[PDB]
């Protein structure tokens, strides 16, 4: 079972439409999305 707590809230009041993540590169992982 999970127990998630509130971290922080910033009121900026801007329209949000698209979402994406930011990764790193170098010169094997998994992640999900829930709606």
């Amino acid at each position: 079972f999970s127990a998630l707590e509130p971290l922080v809230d910033l009121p900026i009041g801007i329209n949000i439409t698209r979402f994406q993540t930011l990764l790193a590169l170098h010169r094997a992982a998994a992640y999900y999305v829930g709606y």
């Binding site: 707590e5 509130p6 009121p11 009041g13």
Partner: protein, 49 residues
């Protein structure tokens, strides 16, 4: 003044400690009457109610 939420505002004054007197109070918008007596049960590190 815009539709955006307020980020800067005026100050607020603080009153001294008091207990054991049935007096009106105001904590973050919560106004009521009671006896502000001490407690023992512990809250979460982020709960204020």
């Amino acid at each position: 003044l815009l539709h955006a939420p307020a980020t800067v505002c005026g100050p607020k004054k603080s009153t001294n400690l008091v207990k054991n007197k049935c007096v009106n109070f105001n904590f973050n918008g919560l106004t009521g009457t009671g006896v502000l007596t001490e407690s023992n049960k512990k809250f979460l590190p982020f709960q204020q109610f």
